[PDB]
Design a protein around this nucleic acid. Structure first.
Ligand SMILES: [Mg+2]
Ligand code: NA
Ligand SMILES: [Zn+2]
Length: 358
DNA sequence: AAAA
């Protein structure tokens, strides 16, 4: 019996149901754009459970015993079995609002509100937006347009590794005992990503040293001429606050959203223009004692994290977020030195990072 | 808006 929770499923990158899940992901994305949160969640849970299957669906009978497959979802699956296409997902792909929202939000610094504003102004192409003489752009959007082609091309593993080397070299210069871990999609085994994420932590750094590291590292890159964009969010972390109750938990750790200049000579790949590539990089600094909670939250996937927190609350009366694990019955915070200890506290079989592609 |  396949669990309704992604945290009780093993979801690897050999997806045998991409025909179904690509269509369900499009429908979920459209529901997000149309502000239909409920329908979005239902399509995400259905897509997630099919991604966990070790075999492709080839008949409606193959869907028996699978949870999170409501009547609307089963009609979509039936239609794809019929002629290899989803008429519902095809209509979303041809919808003018959907096309414009995908295109506009593909720019770094453009979210749902700005994409909606530009659509209602009559804009449909990035060329018309960039060349407009009346529009005013945020600093984030200016960087998004300046480095657009590099940011929309996928970051691959040789590029992610080259960025890891840069991050580690900069960090150990100021904190030699620091631990730097690549998180997100690449930690889950993905071949590509839209960015490269890292978790930094130091066992001996002070509260002030911990606060200053991201400022020191980004000033070092700024001096080197490698910092193309930088936004540092100061920590709002509270050592003794209960973890978040929210469906989508916020991360309160100090972090930075960057664009780095990655010189082609630093990339050891099988394969050239300007000789460098703009790469989105996120750095997160956390206190040493919370490193396993942060690693778990930043490794993802988003669906795996949502179900982990939902399982903790509904099944174990525990409160989990990126900073801590609190037991409401025992009235104690639970400590962990690894992700394995967090899973053990939750009464879950350990799911490897490459098995969290829910 | 940036974020798994
Ligand atoms: Mg990522
Ligand atoms: Na965007
Ligand atoms: Zn990121």
């Amino acid at each position: 019996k396949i669990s309704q929770y992604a945290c009780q499923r093993r979801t690897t990158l050999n997806n045998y149901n991409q025909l179904f899940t690509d269509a369900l992901d499009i429908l979920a994305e459209n529901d997000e754009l149309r502000e239909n949160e409920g329908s979005c969640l239902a399509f995400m849970r259905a897509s997630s459970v099919l991604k966990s299957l070790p075999f492709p669906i080839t008949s409606m009978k193959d869907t028996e015993g699978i949870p999170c497959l409501g009547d609307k979802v089963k009609s979509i699956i039936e239609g794809i079995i019929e002629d290899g296409e989803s008429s519902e997902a095809k209509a979303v792909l041809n919808d003018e609002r959907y096309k414009s929202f995908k295109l506009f939000t593909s720019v770094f610094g453009v979210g749902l509100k700005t994409a909606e504003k530009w659509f209602r102004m009559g804009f449909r192409t990035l060329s018309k937006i960039q060349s407009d003489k009346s529009l005013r752009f945020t600093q984030m959007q200016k960087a998004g347009f300046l480095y657009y082609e590099d940011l929309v091309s996928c970051v691959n593993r040789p590029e992610a590794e080259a960025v890891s080397m840069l991050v580690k070299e900069a960090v150990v210069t100021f904190l030699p005992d620091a631990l730097v871990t690549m998180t997100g999609g690449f930690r889950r085994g993905k071949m590509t990503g839209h960015d490269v994420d890292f978790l930094i932590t130091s066992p001996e750094a002070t509260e002030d040293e911990e606060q200053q590291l991201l400022h020191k590292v980004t000033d070092f890159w700024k001096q080197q001429g490698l910092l193309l964009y930088c936004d540092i969010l100061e920590s709002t972390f509270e050592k003794f606050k209960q973890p978040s109750r929210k469906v989508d938990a916020l991360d309160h750790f100090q972090k930075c959203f960057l664009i780095l200049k990655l010189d082609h000579g630093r990339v050891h790949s099988e394969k050239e223009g300007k000789g460098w590539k703009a790469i989105r990089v996120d750095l997160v600094m956390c206190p040493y004692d919370r490193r396993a909670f942060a690693l778990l939250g930043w490794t993802g996937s988003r669906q795996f994290e949502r179900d982990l927190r939902r399982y903790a609350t509904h099944e174990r009366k525990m409160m989990l977020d990126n900073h801590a694990l609190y037991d409401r019955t025992k009235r104690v915070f639970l400590e962990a030195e690894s992700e394995e200890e967090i899973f053990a506290h939750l009464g879950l079989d350990y799911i490897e990072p490459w098995e969290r592609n829910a």
